[PDB]
Structures are given as structure tokens and as C-alpha cells.
Coordinates of C-alpha atoms in Angstrom, one line a residue:
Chain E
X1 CA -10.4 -3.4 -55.2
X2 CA -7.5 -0.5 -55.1
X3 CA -9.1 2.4 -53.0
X4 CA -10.8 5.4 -53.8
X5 CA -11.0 9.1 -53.3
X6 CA -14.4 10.2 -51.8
X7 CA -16.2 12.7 -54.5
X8 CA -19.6 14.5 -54.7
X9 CA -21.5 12.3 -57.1
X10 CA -21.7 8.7 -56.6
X11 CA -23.8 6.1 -59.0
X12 CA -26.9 5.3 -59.0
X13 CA -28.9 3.8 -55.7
X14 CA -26.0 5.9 -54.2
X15 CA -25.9 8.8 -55.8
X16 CA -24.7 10.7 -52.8
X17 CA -27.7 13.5 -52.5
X18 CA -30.1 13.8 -49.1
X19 CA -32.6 11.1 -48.1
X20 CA -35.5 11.9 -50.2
X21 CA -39.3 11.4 -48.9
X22 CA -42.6 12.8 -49.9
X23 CA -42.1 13.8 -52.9
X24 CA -44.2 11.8 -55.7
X25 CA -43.6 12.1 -59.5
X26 CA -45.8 11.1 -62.7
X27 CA -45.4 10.7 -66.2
X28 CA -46.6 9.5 -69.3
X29 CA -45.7 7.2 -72.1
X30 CA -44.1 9.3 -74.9
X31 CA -46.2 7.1 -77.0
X32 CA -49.0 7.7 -75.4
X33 CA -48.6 11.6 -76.1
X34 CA -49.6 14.2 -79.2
X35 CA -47.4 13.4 -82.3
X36 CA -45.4 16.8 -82.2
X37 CA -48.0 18.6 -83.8
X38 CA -49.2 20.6 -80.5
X39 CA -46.3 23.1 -79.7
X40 CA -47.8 26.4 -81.4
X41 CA -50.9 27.4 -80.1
X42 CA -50.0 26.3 -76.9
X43 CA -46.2 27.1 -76.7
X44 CA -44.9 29.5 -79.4
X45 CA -46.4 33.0 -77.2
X46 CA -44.8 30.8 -74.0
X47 CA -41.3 30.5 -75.4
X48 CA -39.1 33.9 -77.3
X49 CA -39.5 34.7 -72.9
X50 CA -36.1 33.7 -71.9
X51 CA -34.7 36.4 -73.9
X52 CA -36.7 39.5 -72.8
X53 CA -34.7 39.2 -69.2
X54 CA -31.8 38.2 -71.2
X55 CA -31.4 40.7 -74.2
X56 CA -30.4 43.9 -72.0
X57 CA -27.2 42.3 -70.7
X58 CA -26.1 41.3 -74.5
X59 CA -27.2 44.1 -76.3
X60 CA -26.1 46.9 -73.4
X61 CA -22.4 45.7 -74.1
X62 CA -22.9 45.0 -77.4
X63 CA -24.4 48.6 -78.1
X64 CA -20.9 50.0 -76.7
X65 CA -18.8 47.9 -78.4
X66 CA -20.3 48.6 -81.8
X67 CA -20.6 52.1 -81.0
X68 CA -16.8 52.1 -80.3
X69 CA -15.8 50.3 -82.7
X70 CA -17.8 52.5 -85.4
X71 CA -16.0 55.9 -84.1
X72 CA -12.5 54.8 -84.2
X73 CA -12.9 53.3 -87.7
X74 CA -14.7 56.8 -88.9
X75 CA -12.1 58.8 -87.1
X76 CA -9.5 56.5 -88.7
X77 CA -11.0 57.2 -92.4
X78 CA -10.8 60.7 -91.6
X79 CA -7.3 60.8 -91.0
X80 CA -6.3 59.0 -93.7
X81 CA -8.4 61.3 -96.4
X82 CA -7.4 64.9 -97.6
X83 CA -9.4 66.9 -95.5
X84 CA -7.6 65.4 -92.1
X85 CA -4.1 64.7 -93.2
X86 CA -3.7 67.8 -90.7
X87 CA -4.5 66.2 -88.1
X88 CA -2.8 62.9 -89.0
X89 CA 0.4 65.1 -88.8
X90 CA -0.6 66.1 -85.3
X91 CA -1.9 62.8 -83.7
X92 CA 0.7 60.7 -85.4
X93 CA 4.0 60.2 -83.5
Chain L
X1 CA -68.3 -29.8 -58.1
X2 CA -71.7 -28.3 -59.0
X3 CA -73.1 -24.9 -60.9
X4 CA -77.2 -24.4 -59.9
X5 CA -78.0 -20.7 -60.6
X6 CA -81.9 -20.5 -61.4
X7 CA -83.5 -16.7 -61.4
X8 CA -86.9 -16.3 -59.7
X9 CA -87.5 -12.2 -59.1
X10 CA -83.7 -12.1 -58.0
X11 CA -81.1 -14.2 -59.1
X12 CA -79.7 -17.6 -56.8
X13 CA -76.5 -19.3 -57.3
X14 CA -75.3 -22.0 -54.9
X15 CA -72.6 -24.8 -55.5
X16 CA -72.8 -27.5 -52.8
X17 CA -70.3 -30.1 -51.6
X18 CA -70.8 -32.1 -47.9
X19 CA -68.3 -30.5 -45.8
X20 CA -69.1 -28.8 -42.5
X21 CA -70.8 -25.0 -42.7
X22 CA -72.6 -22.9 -45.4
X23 CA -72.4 -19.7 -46.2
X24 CA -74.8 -16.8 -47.7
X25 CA -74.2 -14.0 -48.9
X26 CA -75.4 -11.3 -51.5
X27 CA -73.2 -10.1 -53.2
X28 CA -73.5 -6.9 -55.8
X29 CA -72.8 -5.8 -59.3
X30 CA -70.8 -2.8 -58.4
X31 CA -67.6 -2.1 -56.4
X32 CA -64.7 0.8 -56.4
X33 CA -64.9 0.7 -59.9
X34 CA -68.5 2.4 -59.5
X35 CA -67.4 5.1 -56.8
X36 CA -66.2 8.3 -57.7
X37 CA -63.0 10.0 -57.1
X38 CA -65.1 12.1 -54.0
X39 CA -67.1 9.8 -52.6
X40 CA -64.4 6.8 -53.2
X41 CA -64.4 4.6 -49.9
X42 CA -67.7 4.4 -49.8
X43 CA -68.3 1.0 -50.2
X44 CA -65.4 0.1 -47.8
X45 CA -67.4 2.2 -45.0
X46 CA -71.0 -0.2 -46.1
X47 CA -68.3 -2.9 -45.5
X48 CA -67.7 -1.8 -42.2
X49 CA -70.8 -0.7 -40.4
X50 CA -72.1 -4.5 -41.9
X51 CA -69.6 -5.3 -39.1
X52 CA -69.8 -3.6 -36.7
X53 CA -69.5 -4.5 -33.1
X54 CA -73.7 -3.8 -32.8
X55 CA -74.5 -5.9 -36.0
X56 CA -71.6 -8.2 -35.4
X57 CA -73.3 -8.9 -31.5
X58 CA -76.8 -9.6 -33.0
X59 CA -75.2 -12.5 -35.1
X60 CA -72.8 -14.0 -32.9
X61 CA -75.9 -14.3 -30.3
X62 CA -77.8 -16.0 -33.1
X63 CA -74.4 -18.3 -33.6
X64 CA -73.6 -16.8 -37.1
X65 CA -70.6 -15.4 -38.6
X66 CA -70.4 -12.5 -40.7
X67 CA -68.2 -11.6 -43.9
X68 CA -67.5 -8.6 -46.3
X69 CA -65.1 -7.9 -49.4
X70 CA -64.8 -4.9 -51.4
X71 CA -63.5 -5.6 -54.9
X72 CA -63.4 -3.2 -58.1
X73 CA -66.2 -4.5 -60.3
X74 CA -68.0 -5.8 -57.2
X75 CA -69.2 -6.2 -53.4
X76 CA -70.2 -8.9 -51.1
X77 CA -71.6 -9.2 -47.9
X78 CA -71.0 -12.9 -46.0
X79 CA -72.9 -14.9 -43.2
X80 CA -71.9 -18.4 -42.6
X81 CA -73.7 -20.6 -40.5
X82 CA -73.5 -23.8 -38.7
X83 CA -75.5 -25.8 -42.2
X84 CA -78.9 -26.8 -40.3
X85 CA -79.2 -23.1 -39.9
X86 CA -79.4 -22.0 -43.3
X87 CA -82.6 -20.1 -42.3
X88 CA -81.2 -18.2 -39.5
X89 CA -78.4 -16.7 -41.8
X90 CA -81.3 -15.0 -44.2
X91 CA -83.2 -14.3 -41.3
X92 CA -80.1 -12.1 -40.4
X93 CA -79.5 -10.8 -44.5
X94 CA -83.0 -9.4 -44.5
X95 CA -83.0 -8.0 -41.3
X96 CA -80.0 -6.0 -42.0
X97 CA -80.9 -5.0 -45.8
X98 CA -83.9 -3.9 -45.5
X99 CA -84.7 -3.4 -41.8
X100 CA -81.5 -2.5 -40.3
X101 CA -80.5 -0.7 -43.3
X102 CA -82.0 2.4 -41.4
X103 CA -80.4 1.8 -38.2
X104 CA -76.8 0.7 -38.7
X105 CA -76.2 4.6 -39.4
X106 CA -76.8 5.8 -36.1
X107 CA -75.1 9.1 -35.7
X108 CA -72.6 7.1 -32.8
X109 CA -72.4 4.2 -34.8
X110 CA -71.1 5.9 -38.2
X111 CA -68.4 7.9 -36.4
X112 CA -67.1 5.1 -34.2
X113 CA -66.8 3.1 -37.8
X114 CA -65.8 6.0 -40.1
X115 CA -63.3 6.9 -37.6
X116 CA -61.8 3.3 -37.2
X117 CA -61.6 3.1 -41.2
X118 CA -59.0 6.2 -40.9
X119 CA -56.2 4.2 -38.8
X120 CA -57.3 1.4 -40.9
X121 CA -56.5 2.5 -44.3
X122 CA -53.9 5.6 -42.6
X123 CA -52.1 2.2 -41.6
X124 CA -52.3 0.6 -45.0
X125 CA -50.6 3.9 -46.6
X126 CA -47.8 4.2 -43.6
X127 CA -47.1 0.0 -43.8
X128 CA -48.2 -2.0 -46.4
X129 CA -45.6 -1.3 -49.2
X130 CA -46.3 -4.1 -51.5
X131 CA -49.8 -3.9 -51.6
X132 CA -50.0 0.1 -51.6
X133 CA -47.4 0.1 -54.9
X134 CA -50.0 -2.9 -56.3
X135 CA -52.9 -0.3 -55.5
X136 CA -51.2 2.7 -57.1
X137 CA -50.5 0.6 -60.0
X138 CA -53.5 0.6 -61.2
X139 CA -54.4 4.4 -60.4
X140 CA -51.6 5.2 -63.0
X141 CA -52.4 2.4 -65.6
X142 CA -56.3 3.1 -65.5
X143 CA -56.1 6.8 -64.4
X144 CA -59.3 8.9 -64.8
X145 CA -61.2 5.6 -65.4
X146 CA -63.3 3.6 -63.1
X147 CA -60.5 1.1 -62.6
X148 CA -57.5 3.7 -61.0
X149 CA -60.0 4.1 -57.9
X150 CA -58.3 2.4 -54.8
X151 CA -60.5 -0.5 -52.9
X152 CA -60.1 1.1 -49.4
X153 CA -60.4 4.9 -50.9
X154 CA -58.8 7.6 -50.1
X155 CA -57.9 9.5 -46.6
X156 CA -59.1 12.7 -48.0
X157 CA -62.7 11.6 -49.9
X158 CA -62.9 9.4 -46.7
X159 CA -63.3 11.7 -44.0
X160 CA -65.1 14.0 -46.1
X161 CA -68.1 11.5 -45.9
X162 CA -71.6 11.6 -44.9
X163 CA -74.6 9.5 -44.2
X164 CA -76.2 10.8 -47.1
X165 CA -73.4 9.3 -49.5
X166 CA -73.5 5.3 -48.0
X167 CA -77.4 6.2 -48.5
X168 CA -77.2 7.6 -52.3
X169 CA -74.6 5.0 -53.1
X170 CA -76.9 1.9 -51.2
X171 CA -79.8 3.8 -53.1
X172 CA -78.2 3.4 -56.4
X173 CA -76.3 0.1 -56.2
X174 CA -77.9 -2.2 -53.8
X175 CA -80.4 -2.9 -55.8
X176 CA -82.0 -6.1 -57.7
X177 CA -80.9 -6.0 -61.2
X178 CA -77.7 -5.5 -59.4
X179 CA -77.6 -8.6 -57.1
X180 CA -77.1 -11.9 -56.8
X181 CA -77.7 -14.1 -54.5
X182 CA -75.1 -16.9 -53.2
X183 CA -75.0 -20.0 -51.3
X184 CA -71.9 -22.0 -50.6
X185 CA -70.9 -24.8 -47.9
X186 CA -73.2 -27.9 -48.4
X187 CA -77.0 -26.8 -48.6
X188 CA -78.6 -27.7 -51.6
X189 CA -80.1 -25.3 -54.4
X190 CA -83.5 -26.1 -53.8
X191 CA -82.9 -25.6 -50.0
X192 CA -82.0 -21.9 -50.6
X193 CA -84.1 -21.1 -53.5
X194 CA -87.3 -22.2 -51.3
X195 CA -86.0 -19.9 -48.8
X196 CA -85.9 -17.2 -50.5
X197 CA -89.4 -17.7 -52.9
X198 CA -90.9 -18.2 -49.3
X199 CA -90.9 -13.9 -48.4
X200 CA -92.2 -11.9 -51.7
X201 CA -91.6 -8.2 -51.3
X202 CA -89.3 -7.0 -54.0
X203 CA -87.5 -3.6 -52.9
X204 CA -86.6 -1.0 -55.5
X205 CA -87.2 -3.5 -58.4
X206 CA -87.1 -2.2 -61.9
X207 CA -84.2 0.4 -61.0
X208 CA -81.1 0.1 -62.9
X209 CA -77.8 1.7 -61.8
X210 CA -76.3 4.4 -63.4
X211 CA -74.1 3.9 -66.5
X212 CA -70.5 5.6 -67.2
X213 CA -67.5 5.6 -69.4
X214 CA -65.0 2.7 -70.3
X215 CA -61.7 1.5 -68.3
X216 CA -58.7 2.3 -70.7
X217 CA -54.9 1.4 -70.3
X218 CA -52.2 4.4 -70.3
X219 CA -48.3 3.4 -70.2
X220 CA -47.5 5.7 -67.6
X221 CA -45.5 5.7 -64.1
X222 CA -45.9 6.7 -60.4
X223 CA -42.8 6.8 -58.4
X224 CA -43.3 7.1 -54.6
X225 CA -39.7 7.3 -53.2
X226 CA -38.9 7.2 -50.0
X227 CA -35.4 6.5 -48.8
X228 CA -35.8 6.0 -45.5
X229 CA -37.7 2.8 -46.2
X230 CA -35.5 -0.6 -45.9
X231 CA -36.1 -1.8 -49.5
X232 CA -37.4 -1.1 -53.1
X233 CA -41.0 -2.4 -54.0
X234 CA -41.6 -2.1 -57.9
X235 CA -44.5 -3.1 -59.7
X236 CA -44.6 -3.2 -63.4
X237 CA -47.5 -4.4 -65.8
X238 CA -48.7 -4.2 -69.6
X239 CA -52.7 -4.3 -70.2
X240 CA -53.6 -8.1 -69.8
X241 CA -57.3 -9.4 -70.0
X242 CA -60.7 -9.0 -68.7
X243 CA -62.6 -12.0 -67.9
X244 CA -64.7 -13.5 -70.7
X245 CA -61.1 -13.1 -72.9
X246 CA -60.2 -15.5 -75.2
X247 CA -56.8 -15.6 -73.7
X248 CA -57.5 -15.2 -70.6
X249 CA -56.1 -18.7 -69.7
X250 CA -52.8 -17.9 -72.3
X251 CA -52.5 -14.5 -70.0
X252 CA -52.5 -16.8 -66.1
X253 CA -50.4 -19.4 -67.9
X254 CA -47.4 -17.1 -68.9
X255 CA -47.8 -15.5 -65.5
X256 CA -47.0 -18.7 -63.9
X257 CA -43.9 -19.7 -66.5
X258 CA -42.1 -16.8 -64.7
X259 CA -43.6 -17.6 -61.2
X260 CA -43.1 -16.3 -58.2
X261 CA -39.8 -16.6 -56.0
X262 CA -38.6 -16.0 -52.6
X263 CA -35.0 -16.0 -52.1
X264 CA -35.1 -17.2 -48.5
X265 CA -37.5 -20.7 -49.4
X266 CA -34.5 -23.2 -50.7
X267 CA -37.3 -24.3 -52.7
X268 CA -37.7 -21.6 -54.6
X269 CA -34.4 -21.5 -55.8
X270 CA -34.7 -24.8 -57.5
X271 CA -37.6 -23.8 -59.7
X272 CA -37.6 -24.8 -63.4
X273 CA -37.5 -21.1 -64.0
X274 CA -34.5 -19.8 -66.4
X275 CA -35.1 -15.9 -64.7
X276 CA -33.7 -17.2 -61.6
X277 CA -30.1 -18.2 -63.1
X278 CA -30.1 -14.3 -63.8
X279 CA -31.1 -13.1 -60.8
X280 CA -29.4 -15.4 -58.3
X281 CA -25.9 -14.7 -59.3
X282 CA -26.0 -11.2 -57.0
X283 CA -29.3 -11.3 -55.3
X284 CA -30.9 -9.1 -57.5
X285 CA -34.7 -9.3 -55.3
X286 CA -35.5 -11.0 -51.9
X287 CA -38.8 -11.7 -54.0
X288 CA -41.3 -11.5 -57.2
X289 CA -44.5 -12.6 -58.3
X290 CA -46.4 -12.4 -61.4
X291 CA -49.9 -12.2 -62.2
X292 CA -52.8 -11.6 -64.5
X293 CA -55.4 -9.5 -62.9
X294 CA -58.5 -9.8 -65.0
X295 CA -61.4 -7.2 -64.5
X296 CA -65.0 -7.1 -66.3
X297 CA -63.1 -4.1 -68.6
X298 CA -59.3 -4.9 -68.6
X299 CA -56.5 -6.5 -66.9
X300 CA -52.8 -5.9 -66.0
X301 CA -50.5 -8.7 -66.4
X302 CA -46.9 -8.2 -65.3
X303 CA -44.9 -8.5 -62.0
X304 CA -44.2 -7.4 -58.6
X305 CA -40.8 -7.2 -56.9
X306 CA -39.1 -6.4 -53.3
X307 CA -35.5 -6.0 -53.0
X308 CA -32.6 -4.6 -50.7
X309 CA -30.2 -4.7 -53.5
X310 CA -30.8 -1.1 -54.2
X311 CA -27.5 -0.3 -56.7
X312 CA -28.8 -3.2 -59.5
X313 CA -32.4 -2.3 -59.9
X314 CA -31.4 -2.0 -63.4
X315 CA -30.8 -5.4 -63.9
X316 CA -33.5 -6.7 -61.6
X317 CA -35.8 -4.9 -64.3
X318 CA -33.6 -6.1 -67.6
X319 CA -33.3 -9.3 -67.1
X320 CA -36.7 -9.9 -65.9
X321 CA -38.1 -8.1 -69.3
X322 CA -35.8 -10.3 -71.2
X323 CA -37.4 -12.9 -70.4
X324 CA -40.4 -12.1 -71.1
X325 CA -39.5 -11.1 -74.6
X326 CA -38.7 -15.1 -74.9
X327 CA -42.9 -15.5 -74.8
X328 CA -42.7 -14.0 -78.2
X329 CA -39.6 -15.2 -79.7
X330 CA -38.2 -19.2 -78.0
X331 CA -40.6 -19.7 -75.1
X332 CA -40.2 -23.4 -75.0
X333 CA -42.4 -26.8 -75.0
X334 CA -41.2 -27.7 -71.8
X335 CA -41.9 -24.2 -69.9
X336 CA -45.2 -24.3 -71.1
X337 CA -46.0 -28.3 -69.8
X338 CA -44.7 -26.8 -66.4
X339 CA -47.0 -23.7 -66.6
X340 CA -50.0 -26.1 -67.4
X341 CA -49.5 -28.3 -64.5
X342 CA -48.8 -25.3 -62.1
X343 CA -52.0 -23.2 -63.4
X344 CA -53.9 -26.6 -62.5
X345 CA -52.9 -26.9 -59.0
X346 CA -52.8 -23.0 -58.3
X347 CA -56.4 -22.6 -60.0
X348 CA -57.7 -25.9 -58.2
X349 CA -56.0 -25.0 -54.8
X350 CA -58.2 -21.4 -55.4
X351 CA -61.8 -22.9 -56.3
X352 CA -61.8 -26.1 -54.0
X353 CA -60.4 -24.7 -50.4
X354 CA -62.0 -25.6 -47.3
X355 CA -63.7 -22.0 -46.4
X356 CA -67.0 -21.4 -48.3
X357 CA -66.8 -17.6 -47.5
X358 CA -63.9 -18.2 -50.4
X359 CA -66.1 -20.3 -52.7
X360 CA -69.0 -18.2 -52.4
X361 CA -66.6 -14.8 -53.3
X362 CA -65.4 -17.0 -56.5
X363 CA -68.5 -17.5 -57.4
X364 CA -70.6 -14.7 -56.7
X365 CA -67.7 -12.6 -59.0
X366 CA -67.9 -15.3 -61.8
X367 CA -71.9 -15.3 -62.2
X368 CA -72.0 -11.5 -61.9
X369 CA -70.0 -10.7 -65.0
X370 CA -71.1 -14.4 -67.3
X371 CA -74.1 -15.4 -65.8
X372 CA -72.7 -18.8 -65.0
X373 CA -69.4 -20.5 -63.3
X374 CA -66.9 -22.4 -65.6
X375 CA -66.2 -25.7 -63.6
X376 CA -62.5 -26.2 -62.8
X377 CA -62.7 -29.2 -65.1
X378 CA -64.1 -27.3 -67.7
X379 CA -60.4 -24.6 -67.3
X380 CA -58.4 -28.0 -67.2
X381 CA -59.7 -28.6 -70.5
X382 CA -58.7 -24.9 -71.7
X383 CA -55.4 -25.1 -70.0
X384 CA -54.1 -28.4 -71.5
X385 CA -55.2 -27.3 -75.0
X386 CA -53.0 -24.0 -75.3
X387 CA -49.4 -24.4 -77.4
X388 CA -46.6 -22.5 -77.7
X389 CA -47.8 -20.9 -80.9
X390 CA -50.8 -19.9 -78.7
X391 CA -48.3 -18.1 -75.9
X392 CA -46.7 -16.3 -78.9
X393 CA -49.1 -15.2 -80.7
X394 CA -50.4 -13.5 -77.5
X395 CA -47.3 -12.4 -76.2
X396 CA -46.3 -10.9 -79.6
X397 CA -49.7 -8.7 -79.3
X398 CA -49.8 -8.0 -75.2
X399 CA -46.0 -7.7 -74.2
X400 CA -44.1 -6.9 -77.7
X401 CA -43.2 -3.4 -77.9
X402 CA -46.0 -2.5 -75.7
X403 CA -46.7 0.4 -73.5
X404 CA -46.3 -0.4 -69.7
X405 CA -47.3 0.5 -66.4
X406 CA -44.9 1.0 -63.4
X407 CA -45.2 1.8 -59.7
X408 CA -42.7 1.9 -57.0
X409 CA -42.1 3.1 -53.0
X410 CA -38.8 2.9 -51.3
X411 CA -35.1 3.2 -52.2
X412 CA -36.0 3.2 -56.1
X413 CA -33.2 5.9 -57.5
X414 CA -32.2 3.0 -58.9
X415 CA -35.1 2.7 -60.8
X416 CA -34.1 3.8 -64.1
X417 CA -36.4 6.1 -66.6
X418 CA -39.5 4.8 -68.2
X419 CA -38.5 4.8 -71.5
X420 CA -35.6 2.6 -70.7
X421 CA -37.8 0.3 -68.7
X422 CA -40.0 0.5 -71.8
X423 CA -37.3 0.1 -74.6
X424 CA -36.6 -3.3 -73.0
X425 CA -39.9 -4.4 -74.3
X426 CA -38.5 -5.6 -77.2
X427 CA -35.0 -6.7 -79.0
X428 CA -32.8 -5.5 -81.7
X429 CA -33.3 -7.9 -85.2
X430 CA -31.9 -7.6 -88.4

């Protein structure tokens, strides 16, 4: 028809990966399988995983933020009471 | 067209018809179906010794031919003869099964075989695409069941055995309760029978084989890609019937209102067949058959398909499983009348050919699992009796929403996922 720009996905039986060989897959009839009744047990102590590697790069940067976050507001409250209104005069303009 | 099976200590079947040779045979209860997944091949290697260039000599000096088939619920080994020498050929039985049963596994003998059933079923694995997807069909449709074990074994529980396994196995198998005796070609019954009452001496009688657990059907896939094979070769079934069914004549009549097809044959193209004004349109397959494999436990009925049209799989598989949603639904007078008169000459063209090696398989399986042959006159009768409502109702139980069974080697990324292959099983109503 009109052309076409070559990409890096085709459609399927040309999909546009390698030439695959020796590799054999199985499966099994979802209605063949345990009404979803089985994951506990097998796959409750499996799973909350994915989360121990992961909870150290969201909660390091969280940690900081919140702790940053909780200073200025403090330092903030404390100018703006009696006791610093000193200070406020000082850091001000 | 005769049926005279008469039990003395073992049991004789024979079915004579003047027409040049005969053939005898024994031919046992128990096949692949028996093995088990570590000593499966077994009865491929029996098979191949019984042929061997040292046993095959001492017949073809005598003027006899010899014979062997390994099937899943049985076995059967051949001799055919030239018909005044219906002697000479269990002369030749008896010298091998009981005699010669201790000298066929000569340590030189057993190597030279074992190692010539390696390139042999190597070769089968490496080549023969339709019939290795056909054989891995029914591993995944009857896995972990008697049934999913492969005629011709495996490489790896083949070259792992011994002389002690064909021994356990013969020791277990071969016996009488497990065996029937069979005479095809033209000899009569009481020619045989005679024969055979003649020598006494019963071997191992009283010993049954050894029990196990039940075939079973699970809707499941294998998918052996390969792209660097020329074509796609799918197989796809649902459980069909075991022999002894009461629709196992429905189950090999729908099979044949779909057919079989060959792109190439201008014939073929002109079949009374509404699939093909689907598939014809782009050349969706070079080929497809159907079929309804019946086994003493279960059966697969579906089809089988090659094609180099490798970016429509999809629609290779849709339309194919439309149509078969019509057995349910409109499958029509007129399909049926052509099934019936294409069962007939398919199912006659089977049970009367000129090779009694044939007959004698057909009925050596047949008297094995009923304890008696169903004359082809008899099936006619059976055939020309089923209606549409008959099709239906076992279509609507068999192939309706069903669970099903696929296989496939070659260029199959086209192949789409099972539960879209599977969803097609049915249509949408209100």
C-alpha cells in the first residue's frame, strides 16, 4: 500500500525478535486449575518480598524529607511565638 | 466377511477370505500405555530384536515374512506366509517365544538393535514434524497417565535400557491371559485352531499383569517452536471416545464432515466442505485432517494442520473452531448424508484391504478390548442410523465449551494463547 517506516516491533508471525529454537513451554487450562482458594498457605510468606529490597530507597528519602520538612515548620512556630519574636527580628529581612 | 474367535487354553481369532497369503501373528493385551515413564521404549526395542537381521534370516530361509506394531493399549508380532504354509509360520512363533526368547538378547545382538533404535527414533524427533506434534499431543492431553507415553519412547529412557527390562516387561506382559492369537489371509479357523491344540505346554499360565491407574484428559498445551523450520504444524483436540462408546460412530462421523484437505490436490478444493470457503480465500494451511482416535480408556477428537502462512495462524484456528461450533448449533441434513457415505468407504477401504498383516492388526486390537469383531456391515448399520439430533447432542457435550488440547512445532508465534484458542469453543447468545 503507501510505504512504511521500519520500527522494532512488528505483528505477530513477524514480530521482529531473534529466531527462536529449543526452548519448549507448557501450560494448563485455567479451568483445569484450583478455584482461587490456594494463594495463602502457599503464597502469602512468598509475596510482602518485593518490598524488603525496595523499602530502603523510599523510605531513605522519605526519612529526609519528613525530617526536613518537620524542622522548618518547628523553627517557623518558633519565630512566630513570644519567646522568638527576637529572632524573627534578626532573620527577617 | 467372517468373525471365528473360539478360546481353547489361549484364545484364537481368524477371519478368512480366498485371496493369496495368510498371516499369524500374536498379538498382546498391553502396549506404551503399560510402560513406564523409565523404561518407556521397551516394547519398541521387543519390536526390534523380533526383527532383527538374525531372526529375520531364519524366516526368510524358511520363505516367511515377519511383522511388528507397537500401539498404546497393545502389541503385535506378524509372520505371513505363502497360505499352504500355515504350519511353518507357528513353527517360527514358537520357536521365537519360547525358544528363542533366550537368545535374541545376545549381548551383540541387543546393542546392534538398541543402537539402531537411537537414529531411528533420534530421526523421528529431528524430521517427522507432523507426527512428533501428533505424539506430543497426547503427552500433554493425557499427561502423568498411561496414555501421554510416546509409542517409540523416549531418547533418554531408551538408552538407559537393559536386558533385564525387555525381560521384566516380556515376564510381565507376554503372557496368556494377555494374548490372543490371530489368523488372517485365507486359512480357515479350524485349520489354525488344530494347529495350535496340536502342542500343549502352557507357559506362565495363571499370571495376570499388573494393574494401574486410569487415563484422564487435561486441557493443556505444549508449544515446541522452532523458527528455523519451513512451516507451522498445530494439532489441536478435545477428549473424544474410547472404543466400546456409544458415540463412537457420532465421534468418526463429525471427523469426517470436516475432512481432510490438501491445498495442492484440485480435488480437494472441491469438497462439499463449508471450512474450505474460509480458508481458501488466503491460503490459510497447505493441509488438515481430522480424526477420532479411540483408545480402551479415552480418545482425542480434533484436527491437525501444516501451513506456511505463518502471519494468519489466528484465523487458520478461528475459523476452523467455528465450524465446529455448527455440530452443536446448524450442522446440517446434508453434511451429515455426506459424512455417512464417506465414513463407509473410509471404514470399508480400512477393514477390507489386500494386506492381511492389516487385517490381522484390525482385528487382533478389536478382539483384545470386546472379545469379538463388529463386521463392517454391522458399522453400516450404526452409521446410517445416526441424525443430526444425534451429532448435536454429542457435540453440545464433547466440543461445547470444552477444555482442549494443543500441540505445535515450527514457526507457531502466530499461534495465539490458549485461552483464546479455548474461548473459541463456543459463541456469544442472548
Amino acid at each position: 500500500g503507501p510505504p512504511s517506516g521500519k520500527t522494532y516491533m512488528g505483528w505477530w508471525g513477524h514480530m521482529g525478535g531473534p529466531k527462536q529454537k529449543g526452548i519448549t513451554s507448557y501450560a494448563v487450562s485455567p479451568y483445569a486449575q484450583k478455584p482461587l482458594q490456594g494463594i495463602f498457605h502457599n503464597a502469602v510468606f512468598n509475596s510482602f518480598r518485593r518490598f524488603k529490597s525496595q523499602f530502603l530507597y523510599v523510605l531513605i528519602p522519605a526519612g529526609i524529607y519528613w525530617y526536613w520538612w518537620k524542622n522548618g515548620n518547628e523553627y517557623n512556630e518558633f519565630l512566630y511565638s513570644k519567646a522568638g519574636r527576637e529572632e524573627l527580628e534578626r532573620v527577617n529581612v | 466377511a467372517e468373525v471365528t474367535q473360539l478360546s481353547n487354553g489361549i484364545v484364537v481369532a481368524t477371519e478368512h477370505n480366498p485371496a493369496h497369503t495368510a498371516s499369524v501373528g500374536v498379538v498382546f493385551g498391553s502396549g506404551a500405555a503399560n510402560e513406564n515413564p523409565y523404561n518407556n521404549g521397551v516394547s519398541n526395542l521387543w519390536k526390534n530384536i523380533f526383527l532383527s537381521k538374525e531372526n529375520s534370516a531364519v524366516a526368510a530361509k524358511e520363505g516367511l515374512a515377519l511383522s511388528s506394531n507397537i500401539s498404546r493399549d497393545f502389541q503385535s508380532y506378524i509372520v505371513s506366509s505363502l497360505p499352504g504354509s500355515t504350519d511353518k509360520s507357528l513353527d517360527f512363533l514358537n520357536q521365537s517365544f519360547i525358544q528363542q526368547k533366550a537368545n535374541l538378547l545376545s549381548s551383540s545382538n541387543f546393542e546392534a538393535t538398541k543402537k539402531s533404535v537411537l537414529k531411528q527414533v533420534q530421526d523421528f524427533e529431528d524430521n517427522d514434524h507432523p507426527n512428533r506434534v501428533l505424539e506430543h499431543l497426547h503427552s500433554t492431553a493425557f499427561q502423568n497417565t498411561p496414555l501421554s507415553l510416546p509409542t517409540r519412547g523416549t531418547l533418554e529412557s531408551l538408552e538407559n535400557l537393559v536386558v533385564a527390562d525387555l525381560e521384566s516387561f516380556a515376564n510381565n506382559h507376554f503372557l496368556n491371559s494377555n494374548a490372543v492369537v490371530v489368523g488372517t489371509g485365507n486359512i480357515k479357523h479350524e485349520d489354525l485352531v488344530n494347529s495350535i491344540e496340536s502342542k500343549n505346554l502352557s507357559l506362565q499360565t495363571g499370571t495376570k499383569p499388573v494393574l494401574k491407574k486410569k487415563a484422564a484428559f487435561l486441557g493443556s498445551e505444549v508449544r515446541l517452536r522452532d523458527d528455523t523450520l519451513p512451516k507451522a504444524w498445530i494439532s489441536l483436540a478435545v477428549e473424544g471416545e474410547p472404543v466400546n462408546s456409544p458415540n463412537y460412530f457420532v465421534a468418526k462421523l463429525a471427523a469426517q464432515i470436516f475432512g481432510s484437505y490438501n491445498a495442492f490436490e484440485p480435488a480437494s478444493r472441491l469438497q462439499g466442505i463449508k471450512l474450505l470457503d474460509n480458508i481458501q480465500e488466503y491460503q490459510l494451511c497447505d493441509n488438515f485432517n481430522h480424526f477420532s482416535l479411540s483408545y480402551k480408556d479415552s480418545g482425542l477428537w480434533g484436527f491437525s494442520t501444516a501451513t506456511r502462512n505463518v502471519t494468519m495462524i489466528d484465523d487458520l484456528i478461528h475459523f476452523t473452531l467455528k465450524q465446529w461450533n455448527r455440530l452443536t448449533i446448524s450442522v446440517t441434513d446434508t453434511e451429515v448424508e455426506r459424512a455417512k457415505s464417506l465414513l463407509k468407504l473410509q471404514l470399508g477401504q480400512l477393514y477390507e484391504s489386500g494386506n492381511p498383516v492389516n487385517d490381522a492388526n484390525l482385528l487382533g486390537a478389536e478382539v483384545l478390548i470386546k472379545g469379538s469383531k463388529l463386521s463392517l456391515g454391522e458399522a453400516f448399520k450404526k452409521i446410517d442410523a445416526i441424525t443430526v439430533k444425534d451429532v448435536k447432542a454429542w457435540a453440545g457435550k464433547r466440543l461445547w465449551d470444552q477444555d482442549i488440547a494443543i500441540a505445535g512445532t515450527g514457526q507457531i508465534e502466530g499461534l495465539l494463547d490458549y485461552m483464546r484458542i479455548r474461548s473459541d469453543m463456543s459463541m456469544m447468545r442472548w
